[PDB]
Amino acid sequence: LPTYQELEQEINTLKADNDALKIQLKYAQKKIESLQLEKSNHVLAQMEQ
């Protein structure tokens, strides 16, 4: 069986994977919005009211 310490290390790895996927997902969603806005000659940063 894996050691309790190994399980701890695995959790640390999986949390890091989680953090990376979340930031990449936000980045990808912003890119989708940017491409949609490009169709109308606008950029994401100009849309803040």
Place this chain on the structure above:
Amino acid sequence: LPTYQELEQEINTLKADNDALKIQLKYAQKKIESLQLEKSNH
């Protein structure tokens, strides 16, 4: 302190969350590519 069982539980939850994020990211990447293809045609 977390019991060894509760660590196993947390590992399964994290794997599930990570698998769900990978699916959402893949769909986001497909939409980006689709939009780039549309742009190049337009």
